[PDB]
Every structure is written in structure tokens, then in C-alpha cells.
Amino acid sequence: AYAYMTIDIGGGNPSVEMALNSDYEVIELTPLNDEGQKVVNDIDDWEKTDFKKVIDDIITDCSEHGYVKKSKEILISTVYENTEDNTYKKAVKKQLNDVTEKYKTTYRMESLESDMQTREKAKKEGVSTGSYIKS
Numbered sequence: 794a795y796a797y798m799t800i801d802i803g804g805g806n807p808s809v810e811m812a813l814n815s816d817y818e819v820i821e822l823t824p825l826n827d828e829g830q831k832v833v834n835d836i837d838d839w840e841k842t843d844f845k846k847v848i849d850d851i852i853t854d855c856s857e858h859g860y861v862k863k864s865k866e867i868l869i870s871t872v873y874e875n876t877e878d879n880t881y882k883k884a885v886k887k888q889l890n891d892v893t894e895k896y897k898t899t900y901r902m903e904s905l906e907s908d909m910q911t912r913e914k915a916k917k918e919g920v921s922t923g924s925y926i927k928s
Contacts, residue, residue: 799921801868806860807832808921819847825921863899870905870923872912
């Protein structure tokens with residue numbers, strides 16, 4: 794994969810990791826807890842889909858399951874495999890700003906950037922990268 798996006802919904806409920814390719818499309822969708830598993834099993838046609846649309850489906854599905862309401866928190870973290878592809882990184886941060894701007898009035902959005910090294914420590918703890926910097 795080119796990069797890994799995690800989304801953690803609420804103060805501590807569904808947790809998923811998106812693996813993305815060079816075209817910013819979601820190629821892997823990994824639940825990290827049981828609530829994240831119900832979400833992923835409801836999301837339809839996410840393979841090769843632009844990650845901004847998959848975020849839309851995840852947040853909609855979390856709201857419909859009762860995991861988010863207005864003014865609640867959404868935490869996104871991004872890890873890059875190729876630390877030296879700054880062009881890719883700039884494009885993701887641009888697209889993440891489009892995502893957070895779209896939701897700034899409904900949810901409190903937090904977008905963090907981490908690294909593989911931290912992601913492996915989070916994986917050894919069985920939790921999302923994002924939830925690990927918050928731990």
C-alpha cells in the first residue's frame with residue numbers, strides 16, 4: 794500500500810484502517826474493533842474508490858448506527874510508506890483539508906500524521922495508529 798488512513802469515531806467506538814494506493818483509492822479496509830467491523834460490513838463498493846467517498850460512507854454509517862452525533866469527535870491519522878514522495882503527501886493533506894472543511898460544522902475533526910514505526914507499535918497493541926497517539 795502507498796499509505797494508511799485510520800478513522801476513529803467518537804471518544805472510543807468504531808475503529809478502521811484504510812489502505813490507499815497511488816491513486817488515493819482505498820484498496821484495503823481493515824476493522825480494528827467490533828464496532829468498526831459492523832461499519833465495514835455495511836460499506837458497499839469501497840474497493841478502488843477514492844478515499845474521501847469512503848470516509849463519507851464510514852461517517853454516514855457510524856451516524857446511522859448511533860456512534861456519532863453532531864459536535865462529536867472524528868480522529869484521522871495518516872501514515873506514509875514512502876517518506877520521500879512529498880507530491881503524494883501534499884495531495885493527501887490537500888484532500889484531507891477538503892474533508893475536514895466539509896465536516897467542520899457537524900463534527901470536531903482532528904487530522905494527525907504519524908509514521909510506520911508508530912503504526913507497528915499500535916499494531917502490537919491491537920489498536921489503530923490514531924488511537925495510539927491518543928493513548
